[PDB]
Structures are given as structure tokens and as C-alpha cells.
Amino acid sequence: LSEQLKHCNGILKELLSKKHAAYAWPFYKPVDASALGLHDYHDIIKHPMDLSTVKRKMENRDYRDAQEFAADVRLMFSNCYKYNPPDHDVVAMARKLQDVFEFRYAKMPD
Numbered sequence: 879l880s881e882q883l884k885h886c887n888g889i890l891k892e893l894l895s896k897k898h899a900a901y902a903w904p905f906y907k908p909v910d911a912s913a914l915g916l917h918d919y920h921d922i923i924k925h926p927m928d929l930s931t932v933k934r935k936m937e938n939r940d941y942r943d944a945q946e947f948a949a950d951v952r953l954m955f956s957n958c959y960k961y962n963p964p965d966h967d968v969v970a971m972a973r974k975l976q977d978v979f980e981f982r983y984a985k986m987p988d
């Protein structure tokens with residue numbers, strides 16, 4: 879639905895909003911592995927994803943349905959849970975942002 883894609887865009891805007899910036903910020907841009915010294919990142923993560931990429935895809939009308947959008951958002955979180963030890967600060971931030979996402983995604987119009 880166009881309606882469902884608008885709900886997805888609303889979620890995306892919320893994830894990027896000041897309200898959630900304290901825990902969303904690591905997810906704003908692609909992981910710069912070389913800059914961070916994470917020289918194994920691209921050997922472990924096959925499909926990098928981040929909120930700027932989700933935004934560009936939405937703006938370019940790449941997503942054809944809500945589930946395609948959701949798969950990229952969940953991919954972003956899964957990459958974080960795969961790469962980082964579960965006690966890492968960034969994983970705590972991911973869990974909080976994923977809670978924001980999942981509870982609002984569940985309110986999808988249908």
C-alpha cells in the first residue's frame with residue numbers, strides 16, 4: 879500500500895529525529911570500517927545497512943512494500959548484533975532503537 883509505505887516513512891523520520899538521537903546516532907551513516915579500525919567488518923557483514931541508505935532508498939521509491947523496508951531496518955540491527963559482543967555499548971543502543979521500530983511497525987495500517 880501507498881498507505882503502508884507512508885507509515886514506514888513516518889517510522890524512518892522518527893528514527894532520525896532528535897527524540898532518539900542519543901541512541902540512534904551510530905546508525906545514521908554507513909559503518910566506516912577503516913576509520914574505526916574494524917578491518918574484519920566487511921568479512922563478517924555481507925550486506926551493510928544504515929538509516930541514510932534506508933532514507934535514500936525511500937526517496938528513490940526503491941521499496942515496493944512495507945516488508946521490504948522492514949527487512950532493511952532489521953538487517954541494520956542484525957549486522958550490529960552479529961559483529962559486536964552483546965555487552966558492547968552500541969548493542970545497547972541498537973536494542974533501544976529496535977524497540978522504537980518494532981512497536982511502531984506493529985501499528986501498520988492494514
Ligand SMILES: COc1ccc(CCc2nc3cc(-c4c(C)noc4C)ccc3n2C[C@H](C)N2CCOCC2)cc1Cl
Binds near residue numbers: 957958967
Ligand atoms: C560527522 O558525523 C559523524 C560522527 C561520527 C560518526 C561515526 C562514529 C561511529 N559509528 C559507529 C558505528 C558502529 C557500529 C554500528 C552502529 N553497528 O556496528 C558498528 C561497529 C560502532 C561505532 C561507531 N562509531 C564510534 C562511536 C564512538 N561508538 C563507539 C561504540 O559505542 C557507541 C559509539 C559518523 C559521522 Cl558522519
